[model samples]
Target chain A: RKGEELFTGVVPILIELDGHVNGHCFFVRGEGEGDATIGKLSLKFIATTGKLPVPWPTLVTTLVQCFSRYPDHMKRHDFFKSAMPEGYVQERTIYFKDDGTYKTRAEVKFEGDTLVNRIELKGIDFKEDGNILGHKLEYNFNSHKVYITADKQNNGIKANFTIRHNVEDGSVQLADHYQQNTPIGDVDLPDDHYLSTQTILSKDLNEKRDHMVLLEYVTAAGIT
Target chain B: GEELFTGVVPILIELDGHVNGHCFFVRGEGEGDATIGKLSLKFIATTGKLPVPWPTLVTTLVQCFSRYPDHMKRHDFFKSAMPEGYVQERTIYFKDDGTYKTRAEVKFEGDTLVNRIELKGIDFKEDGNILGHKLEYNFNSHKVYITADKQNNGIKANFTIRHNVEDGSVQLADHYQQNTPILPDDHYLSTQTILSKDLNEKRDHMVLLEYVTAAGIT
Candidate 1:
């Protein structure tokens, strides 16, 4: 119920347990400005310790689809002005199991206004030097890794990054990084979680005769 | 510690202190055989699964042929070829010391990039006894479920491909089950425990998954 944070509007996403009578839900907060926002979103799901089985593919797939659709519903100015919406603003019921079969029925709803509804596949792209790079975005359901390619306009750099979704915590973190040097070979950064947002040295580069120069060039660009 | 004996009908490959296998390596007699040689090669061994592994066996054969005196003289035995509309089919057989044998066949449709893998007689066992049942897995689409085989016969156990987020490893988690194609919900409950218990077991599953995924043929 607090405001003034980067992500102002918080919505409670209801997750129905298989046998337990008491209900549980997760909270989704959006971070953005005005009409265009939510570049960084945080999801927190409160649960009783070891009380529920993770929804294999059905409910989980629906939740991710709904989360990607969060920006569409944010167009409404009243979305963030008042107290969070009341009970059952958005409700989704799934009757299928992991193998794409009709099995035990399950449902996931949200408190307050409708935050996520319908499956929206938003196309994301990255470009460099006025040329758009070919990119394919798909969620590896097995590992919850999302491959994302991004182009930073301020630095004139294009790179690919991986976002790891933690199902237990309902949070996403940068897992891998790759920077594409156009007209030249690419450099694969080590899996140092900090490399996603910050710069780090790839010690392996010193061993490669071809890449040893890159280390010096990158340092020169950074320092000088 | 190996001897290649060329004799009567087919070529014999003998290794020291191990069973021997027969291999036939002959040039194709059809068109386009003069300039570029098309080979019809077959290596068959009667040895049990305990001794000669199929993949390791194939690797040795390729190495043997690569250094063959005839190939070195002609300078054209193991050259790479990318013929248009070419469909390359390769099969690897994993035979258990018992009566069960599993065959994994992969077909690559050349530059068209259409690829598929089919596993036959997928039987799981421990201590030389069949303990598990049947399941079908598609490396391309990434799906695993118990289904009838090509002969419409039911499988003997369950084969589940579980992806571990911890180490980013894909594994084939085989378990004993009599369940039908439409697996019950409870079948998923034990998936985590099974994978967590044995990270080192079934290490080939990791290699095969990575091999198929890296090919990008699918």
Candidate 2:
């Protein structure tokens, strides 16, 4: 099969960690492929988050790299093969704050190989004494990861979420370490943060670990 | 209709009309018929020592690509019909501590694609007060129209680079009296001694606009 060119455009991604995610949605400019042969990607952070202690850009890149590992979900060559359905909009509450709640409303469109994930963070403000705030804080933070696997399977029991390649190491330690219940080296994040690579890859479709982390594709909106 | 590929293609952009640099041309899906579809071009400059000047970057592509004789003829007709000042403008910031404000102003005539670049606030002699010389270069004409601050008189010196016609030369013209009478007190930088003097006297701000009369893809 011919290798599909990776998407290059603005992608707004929502990063959720233990439901403590900030209102800022990460915007990524997908620079097509680092190498189309091996399904490698070149992602740059157009917008970043400073509120979280975890290296948010690194986490996003790692997660993007992990997309290639789930071969059943994403074929090596068929990454970003199809355009998002017309007028497709996914709306969901991604985070909650004291004064308001952050909800995501996103739409994906592709121009050739360019994918523009239009994302908006709708802030639904909580009013005094159960009354809704007349005017809500409409913070637009969008995410751009369109995951449309071939089989359309949404399970993760045998998924591998490992860093496939690195400049230092020819290839980072395999995702097999996670299947064997071993630490996949120092995959960075706070010690208290339960959303690790191991946990995300270990769980099945039924065991979605207390909503610690969330990954959604542009094509098929995943169950939150 | 089946869609074509959508991705980023690496492009080599000619900077300063001479220096070659790398950048990416990103495009969306193809529209219309497969043979003739709408093509949109967006450039992402590679992070390097000197940023790619957007004005030169685009004009270079346009002159290289817009080849069909009919389009050129139609473009020329529409260009004259269209009102002036309809231009696509971009600013390139050099971002160095050694004086020199936002680097360059690049503008292209929307229809003509005639490029104009003005390097402002140039500290040629390193004198803060005297650093008011502006070097404006036009690609279509291949001339450097020089101007100075209000304090140093607006039209300090204007020169037509003969480097295009002659090998490595410039015809320095004086525009001191504005364009009222058009003074003909012209000087030529033909020899190596004068060229060396122009380079040495101007310090690091000698504007060079040269082309050997020369002159792209899917």
Candidate 3:
């Protein structure tokens, strides 16, 4: 009789706010009779805010603007190509729209177990205000550990972010990211405010992996 | 699996004005498991000179079976296999004074493997002027012997008793006179006698006799 085996997929590291590090949540094949592979990743975040500068709505607008700079031209790369030669073009995109409130969208592609072709986010709205607030967030994928919280309280500014990657097939992969906040940051504000972000990955992107994002927002006044 | 079974034989003997002996055999059959069973004895002799009656003997024997020791397993088997109201009764007949016949019946009853017994006798009469009598006996030292022939098994037992006869109004001479006043003249050479004289004449005499018989079980 043979013993059962389990495999480890992508291992996620907490990236501090405003910090970016590069590392592949690699899949380690399990030693057993079955062709088992690590294919999932998840990240959870807990956040607390102390003070505020810009109202929550204005602060969300600024963050969304920063994320919306990427053009869709970067989304077509074979991200999972382990042997990607230097300068491999994995097209990524970020877009922002102004309805009654400001909304931002961002999409990024990468490759590991599956090709993370594109990610889309919608409904990023916040009010310009508030003092102290808190939020918890989580992201899940088939091929990677979720990047949860790095730093929770920084003066009046508190933000939580996470990203997850999952193996799609022997080739392609999928990834998702989430960010949430309450109005309590350097951005000065008078009324309490809330902000939240979520992304969805296409099912066709990974035959073996799926991606999900959860964003929560809390304001001194209340969460909307 | 081989079935296991145990057998116990209890015997009761009594001697008083009346004398009787009885034995009962109890067998415990196992469903195939080997285990130990037990046998017990309970004997009683009334206080006076009257010997233990025959029926009482049988009753005591039955009671011994009823009171036999039973382990949990054997007790259960006996409870289920034994018929409802199962009892074995035996009648005993004995010759009374003046050579009259008397009868006694012993019966046993109980729900468990063990039971209490009662002995009852009818038509009893004292022989001449012997006053009250004394009785003494024990059952603890009794033994049961068993033998088997083909499919049949036989059990037999033997024991001893000591009885005291007292309260005779007449002395040995008077007893002889009252018992047998005349002796048949069977030629002096064949008779054994003891003679006594009073007033220069023979007044009292004593004689001893022996009798024996044998019978077969049908």
Candidate 4:
């Protein structure tokens, strides 16, 4: 049986601010099989400073924190949904196939004069092809120079981050972001020191992406 | 000059009786030349009517009579006949060199007395020979005989004299008579008697003499 993605199963994204290539952000994939793979995450650089609409360093930090709530299981749906403007989709799901493939799906519906917010993906397999020379798995993107501030007291902190993917429909579900007092830094920080960011991604052609943020603060004083 | 003489001297034989017996005497003037004499001894015999003081007589007669069973029996018989406290005394004398000489006295007390006997005029010589002597008694009612003197004479003599004591009489018993002519003048006879005839009969007779010449006498 497969497990549902929640905040504990998400992959972290690094947004570097300096060195080599400034203003870079990337997505990282977790390692290992099942839930324990989340501990082996490495980032994949997705955008450079000159090409994105906002200042790349600032935008990458915001996007990395946003997608941080979605694990590999929910990445396909939440990835695009979190990038879309508001009122684009409603209620997303993500699946993981038996062959280690992933999918995303979503439904677009109305709610109180606003667009239904959902996004999903389906059938996006990421596993070994059994040969040493087979297509190298690109699960991590290291993008330097996008300084990421992951402190829980910040406005865009992430909490309860999770990832889900679809097996038959290629749909994904990104769990709602519940911000916590979790710290992110060069030094090793406690699990409770970093915040969470949430986003929804879907593979459907007609629905828009949906996303939300939930904040959890650190009541302990004397912590930066 | 050898002469013979015979006489009665007052010789009292005690324990048997006061007896006057015949004693013979002889004197030698030279070698093998001697004189001789003889006399008969007398005793008062006890009878039922005129039973003379037999105790005293028996005590005196012991001087002359031989120590025999009859003499001892007569002494016992006399003592039994007499009353208690009956006493008597007698003197005995022998011929001296030329005169009569008292020898011993015998006294009786009750049944016994002391008999002291002595002899004088016995010739003293360096060596002397004593002949046989005799006491003549009528063995009519009392059996009397002379006793042997195992000492001095080597012969049975007139009396069985003992130098011991008994009741009522003293005895002067003699063994043998001496000849005055054969004895030197320095020699004498010493005699002792038992007062009781019974004692005389039980013991041997004895007499002692000493002879002396001009040289020595013992």
lDDT (tens digit, per residue) of candidate 2 on A1-224: 11222323233332222212232222222232233233333333222212322223223322232223223333332223322312123334422223344344444334343444444443344334321132121111123333222222321111222322121223221111121111111111111101122111111246322211233232212322
Residues B1-218 of candidate 3: C-alpha lDDT, one tens digit per residue = 00212343222222222221111222211111112222332333333222332212322232122222222222221223232322322343332322111221222122223332334333333342112222112111212211122222111222222122343222110000001000111110011111112244231211111111111111
Better of 2 and 4 by DockQ: 2
* Docking quality (DockQ) of candidate 1: 0.01
Ranking by TM-score: 2, 3, 1, 4
TM-score of chain B of each: 0.20, 0.19, 0.27, 0.20
Answer with 2 or 3, whichever has the higher DockQ.
Answer: 2
Candidates' DockQ values? 0.01, 0.01, 0.00, 0.00
Q: Model 3: per-residue lDDT, tens digit, A1-224?
A: 11111112232222111101011011111110111121222222111111222122211211211111112332121111111111112112212111112222322211232212121212223222211011111122222222222122421222222222222233221112333322211222112222223332222233232221222221121212
Q: What's the true lDDT of residue A174 in model 4? A: 25
Model 2 misplacement above 4 A = A1-39, A48-80, A84-91, A96-101, A123-224, B1-218
Worst 10 residues of 3 chain A by lDDT: A19-28
- List candidate 1 segments past 4 Å from native: A1-120, A126-224, B1-218
RMSD of 4: 85.8
DockQ for the candidate 4 complex? Answer: 0.00
Sorting all predicted structures by lDDT, with the top scorer first, yields: 2, 4, 1, 3
* Candidate 4 lDDT tens digits, B1-218: 00010122223232221111112121111011001111122222221111121221222332221211321332221123122211222232211211112233333333333334332222211111111122121111121232323343211213233322233223333333321100012212122222212233322221211111111122
For residues A166-213, what per-residue lDDT tens digits would candidate 1 score against the true structure? 333343322232332111111111111111121111223333221101
Model 1 chain A: lowest-lDDT 10 consecutive positions: A212-221
